[model samples]
Target: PPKWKVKKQKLAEKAAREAELTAKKAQARQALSIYLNLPTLDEAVNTLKPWWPGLFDGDTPRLLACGIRDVLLEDVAQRNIPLSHKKLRRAMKAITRSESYLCAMKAGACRYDTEGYVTEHISQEEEVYAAERLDKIRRQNRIKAELQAVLD
Candidate 1:
């Protein structure tokens, strides 16, 4: 084979690989989006259990309990907290890193954890409802603690 022909063949191979990667990413994004719309309790448990050790075996609500971490970080001790975009990013990083979700399963360029993937899969209604329910639980817990203190 001529030298120029060899180089041209290599270039064509590289282009094909890049196109395949692009297509794979798009397909994953679409599948993830559909999965997020109405992820069943069983599905969530099956997906999350390996990474999250604290997930209760019998607690079904824990699946719908997604993103509760953000609400906890945002609520309570208001003025005591100062917000930073860096801090927010760090917190999000910790969540994803710890959970080992998608690309976090192993180190890579984080291509699988793209911003579009996360934002696109978000369910606003589920997020808001989860926050509200968490807040109510905290309020009840506070009341219980206060009453116990009074009794003591």
Candidate 2:
């Protein structure tokens, strides 16, 4: 084959591989969205509230017991809910990162189960980590407020 022709063929092959990967990613995203019902984090929390009222008991978020994911999976299975473990994990991720949740993660805080039962206490290490995260979030918020003030 001519050198230029070989180069053109290689480029075409690379393009085809890239296109295939893009298509695969799109297909996986579509499947996840469909299976998880594409709910926002807030919506996911709301949907779970009825099933696990303890997790959303008050204005302050509660620390979830360790291995709560398995409990959630069992609960959903028993109720014939169409939620997936991946979706549940995603919702938990969002909840754990929220400011109120971090604020509630004190050294002596109790982790609650789905039925409002105290399963465990927050470790000192976990409380320190939460405090660091809360500090970072507050710093960012302050910076954003200063920027907004300057803009205004």
Candidate 3:
């Protein structure tokens, strides 16, 4: 085969692989969403609030205590709620990635358990990580606003 034809074939193969991966990822996400029965992140948070009030405080988002997921899974099982570990993990990831949660993760801030009692303090390392993540989110928002301003 000619060099150009070989390159074209390689490109097509790479694109096909990427397309398959994207489709698989989307399918997995859809399955998890259906299994969780929470259409949106907001709904997931609201549904969890009654059961885990400490992690979903109305005004102030609290730093979640370590091992809270295990406790949460046990509670769900006891209540006969059909929940997969991965589905709950995805929901928690969405919750903890929010700006409010990150803001509440100061070094000395208290980490609350499901019962709303303090379980531990956020370590300096964790606090720094949260701060960096928050900074990146704010920076992205600022850039988005600037782009909107330009478009307007």
Q: For each candidate, what is the lDDT?
A: 0.42, 0.77, 0.74
Instruction: List runs of model 1 lying over 4 Å from the truth.
Output: 38-152
Model 3 accuracy (lDDT, Cα): 0.74
Per candidate, the number of residue pairs that clash is 0, 0, 0
Every model's TM-score? 0.27, 0.62, 0.61
Best of the candidates, lDDT: 2
Tens digits of per-residue lDDT for model 3, 9-58 = 99999999999977766665654443334334586576567666767657
Tens digit of lDDT per residue, candidate 2, span 1-152?
89999999999999999999777666655544433334544766776776778888653457899998898998899998878888777778767876788998888889998888999998899999999999887775565455444334
Q: Give the range where candidate 3 is weakest over 10 consecutive residues by summed lDDT.
A: 31-40
**Ordering by lDDT:** 2, 3, 1
TM-score of 2: 0.62
lDDT of 2: 0.77
Q: Write the per-residue lDDT of candidate 1 for residues 25-139, one digit (tens) a residue.
A: 6665654453234334355444434433343334321221335445434542353445444544443333332222321222212121211122224345544554555556456
Query: Residue 57 of candidate 3: its Cα lDDT?
Result: 59
Candidate 1: give its CA RMSD in angstroms.
Answer: 21.4
Superior by TM-score: candidate 1 or candidate 2: 2
